[PDB]
């Protein structure tokens, strides 16, 4: 993970049941960006036509 500076407090309902109210410096500083490597594939089979 990442060690984030969390404050335990309500703040206007934006963490109501178990939501998390994350600041915009956390997505600015890119400390939860992840890299995801999909693989697509194109097979050229031999149809009757």
């Amino acid at each position: 993970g990442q060690n984030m500076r969390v404050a335990f407090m309500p703040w206007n309902g934006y963490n109501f049941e178990d939501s998390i109210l994350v600041s915009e410096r956390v997505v600015q500083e890119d400390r939860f960006t992840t890299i995801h490597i999909q693989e697509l594939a194109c097979v050229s089979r031999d149809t009757k036509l």
Partner: protein, 1345 residues
Amino acid sequence: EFDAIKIALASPDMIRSWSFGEVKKPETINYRTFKPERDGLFCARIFGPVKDYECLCGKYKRLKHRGVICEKCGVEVTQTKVRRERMGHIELASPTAHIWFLKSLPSRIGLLLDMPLRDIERVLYFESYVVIEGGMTNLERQQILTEEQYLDALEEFGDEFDAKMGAEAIQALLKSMDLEQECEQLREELNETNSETKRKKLTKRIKLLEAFVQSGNKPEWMILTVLPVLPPDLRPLVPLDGGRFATSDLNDLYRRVINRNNRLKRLLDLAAPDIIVRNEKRMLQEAVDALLDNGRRGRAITGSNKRPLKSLADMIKGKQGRFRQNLLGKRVDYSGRSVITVGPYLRLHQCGLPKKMALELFKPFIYGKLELRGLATTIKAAKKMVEREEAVVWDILDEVIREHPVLLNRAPTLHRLGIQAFEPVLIEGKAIQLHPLVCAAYNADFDGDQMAVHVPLTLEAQLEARALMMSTNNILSPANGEPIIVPSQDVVLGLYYMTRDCVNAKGEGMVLTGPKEAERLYRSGLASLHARVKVRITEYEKDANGELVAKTSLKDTTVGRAILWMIVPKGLPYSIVNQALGKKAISKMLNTCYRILGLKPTVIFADQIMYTGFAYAARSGASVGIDDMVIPEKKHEIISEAEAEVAEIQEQFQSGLVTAGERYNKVIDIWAAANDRVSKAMMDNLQTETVINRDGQEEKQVSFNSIYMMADSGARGSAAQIRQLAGMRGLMAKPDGSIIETPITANFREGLNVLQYFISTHGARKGLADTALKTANSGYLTRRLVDVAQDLVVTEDDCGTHEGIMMTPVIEGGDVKEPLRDRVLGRVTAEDVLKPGTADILVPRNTLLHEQWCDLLEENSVDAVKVRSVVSCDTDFGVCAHCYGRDLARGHIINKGEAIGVIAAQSIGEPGTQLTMRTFHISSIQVKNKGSIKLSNVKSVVNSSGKLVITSRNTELKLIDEFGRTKESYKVPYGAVLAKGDGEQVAGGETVANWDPHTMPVITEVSGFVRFTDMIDGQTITRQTDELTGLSSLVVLDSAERTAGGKDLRPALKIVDAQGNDVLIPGTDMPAQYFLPGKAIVQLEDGVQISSGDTLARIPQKDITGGLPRVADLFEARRPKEPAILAEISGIVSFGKETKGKRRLVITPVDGSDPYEEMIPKWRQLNVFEGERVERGDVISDGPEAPHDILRLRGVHAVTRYIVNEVQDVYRLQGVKINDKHIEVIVRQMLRKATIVNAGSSDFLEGEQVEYSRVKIANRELEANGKVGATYSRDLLGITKASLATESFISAASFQETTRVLTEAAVAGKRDELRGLKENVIVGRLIPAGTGYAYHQDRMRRRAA
């Protein structure tokens, strides 16, 4: 379009008329050019073309040749959809019995001919022969012979006798048989003969014959002479990736039938050796049965990949079949799915819908609106624009979205509030923002849960999301009127922090001129949210006729309550906000806002409450720290005392003073007491510990501990969980209930060492695994109750009856548990209810008792009110609008077309999710308050002693004060020594009666000498020696050890005068003697006195289940194992032959069938005397009551009251609340069956179980006539058998054994008039329940014009 679904057998001519051509070869396709081979299992000549409007060769491809049958390959040029409806037929060269009609158990073939099953299957496989009208020589019609028997028959009986073999013989047998002739013979055997069970089975066969005649079926159609093959596009053979095809197993099964059929044709035209021909016929029969229902005669074949090939029967039946998994619930377009987040800014009717998730759901509407506004020339330009997300598409989308609701639905939709309609709000993101207040409805939090979105497309479907399924119309739970818009956890804590007070805060004690000034003081920073203060508030009251009379005054409130008062709507009082506002109080405030101001003010109050709660919770900064779990410093000395007592017990165990189990129990008791002590210490340290100064020294108030605030406000917590954080964790438990004696004396604030943690993991994993099932088998009770109680619909505004239930408070034990206002609120009365002095005509008959009439009822302290119930409603095929009362949620009165059955099942099953998945178990009256005595079964005598004694059996005594209301109820035994007797109004601190379980008296009527008549010791009495008092006792016993000479004889105690005459029992001329059964010690002598009910014979010496199984069993209506036998008839009782397990209990009525008698299990403690007049509908031995017993004895209201009270016991045990309308509906479906006692002028069988509604209507229309109706007797079934009997075979095949249902329908030739909720859904029509109920009424009016 189409009326009912007709069903029957299939004539071979009808099966040849279905088909579009025979199937002669087992060829699917060619292996190089994958065109259908023939004249095979995939054929273009039979099953239409394999490409649209295209012949097979290619000679005809244009549309102009539409319909042509091509000259070359005879392939009719038409659509390829045609390949999905045309059927073929295989022509079985030999007959072949339908396995459905040979293993249906009873075998329809078998029970039609009256030939037992093994004989049929022995003639079937050529094991034997069966004669078929074997001439006028020797034999019976269905006389089966062995092989050599037939061989010798052909010698001595050459011709004029014909016995066949195999399915050909069964075909000839069914064919030659004439149904009316045999039916006559059955008439003669049924009415000229009396052998009860033989005639039961006889009449069953008779009914089957009459059904086979009523229908158009012919018995010889149960033998498949012609076999139809499914259309190819239902059993397709599809090209996969790599050229390896994919086929449904039906192609394998059709191929195996076709090869064997062709080989049988071959062998037949070779004159082959007839044993080989027998084998071919047998194999073909087995193949046809694997094709029709595999694994129904032998072992499933096979399959090719070692798994049982599925056949057509498997295609219908099974949980993974066709009636269930794509017929009732299917996949759906115009729907999405996303992670839900919260978004507290939404209004209660709207939800955030991602732009990306909305541009895909409304693409049709967006294309239409683009092409309409001219922004795009055509649908293709529109599609391109949306595909590149032009700038204008977001305006077009905001216009499509505006009034268009969408259905939001969570996964386990337990109750109907799980599919709610919202208006969308195009939000940026990829997560649905769901309004906080709804999450209690959905039972949904934001730990990653997801929801599905659907678009109600059509006009009539998108006014139902607006008028029925919308989020704002649904604020009340249908299981109980309480609003489910309860603010849950941040809101109740914001409101708790707001509306509270501190002993001395900034700006305490300053007069304010209104809520506005309080808010301006708080925002300015000059006065705290809880500072005691006086504010002039003006509250309104609409007890006037709609008018709100105002009133202003200087309330002594705080700044928090002041600021909160601005939010409250007009007509509410100020006491609603002038307490500390927990969670319970917070939802009571909403309930009062509803019950005063209707729906719209409450809907606005909800989100106002929510916004202001979140705002002030955030203002409060209420965090939680590790110092907020203040452990009490008295915990160590309490634990030292506990360890000391435990060491004391260990020493007393090593000393030889207690067993091992006793030391275990004493240790657990010590540790439990110590845990309660430490928790009380930590709570006393937590709750009040805040100590402050007001003008001087000091003062304590309710603590501001953050964790205590969460525990007390009701947001989150209890005493148990805070105790585990602060006190001790107490004793863990192993999974099987085995409580560990080593208690975790630590909390989570301080550490937990390794051993305590490992101990706790036991119960932890048991709880986890248990909720891993209770989630998996989530809604099985709602499913079982939507099966039995589905097709009820409120279909009439009034049936106009006068029958109901005498609803009263459940005043059990002490004070009531459920008052009258809970249980009579919302139901229409059955009869005009007057005051106790009657004073007026208080409440009319058909007035819906809303809140005002309940006010009226508990001003006058009305105790019993008759209120109409749904189990007594006289409607036909439904329930009147008034015999259901007020409907929750919507809260006015149920309008005809409510599907009250589905709602009743869902309301009994969503609450049941909150119950335990396991079934778990659990001198002088301390009478409580002042009041008067109340007698039921008043037969008491005042002894010479002066106190009272119940000379009756079941005298029930109640303490009833000057209120008119009953305040205490009690069951009094047979003649306890009552300190207080009859009608004696007394107060608290005065016991109503003393008794003793070692003392059950046999008190008499009069005073006098107790002579001993009919008493000779050695045969009925026992020699109990008075080593305790210094006398002799002859105690009454039965024939258990005394010989049989005088064993049945009872020891009679003759209560007579001083002269010797038999003093009668006052009331009956039988004198005052008593015949005594055992268990009552006699301390008298012969020729001895007793006072007015002196001690003649003295008899010496609460667990409740609560699991959801205790509701599935309460509804399933089974029989307990200690079944309290009741009093079947009134009159007197006699005891007869004993020592058998059934001692004769004769009941001689007053004027009825006097020799009536029953059996008694003499292992039981029989608790009634033989001289007392038995009352019908009364208990004899004491134990759990049986439902069927009550239903036969006391009436339908008796069984309904019992079932309702038991289910309400198990529901109130866990605090879970559910109304009783729903259980009354489940019962009304439960006792749906009548039974014919007397045939009468009616036209049902003698002892036939018929639908009670049927007998009701028939005998009612006869009562209108001059003929005597049928005297019915109401049955009582379990839900899984009250659902088994359903009129429409579609629904029955849906939720039952499908093969049994379709076989019964096929033979009977039933016609399914689609008039049930579960049938119409299957056939795609409107359910005749809600919005489509008017449509179905118009359909019923069109039919029979």
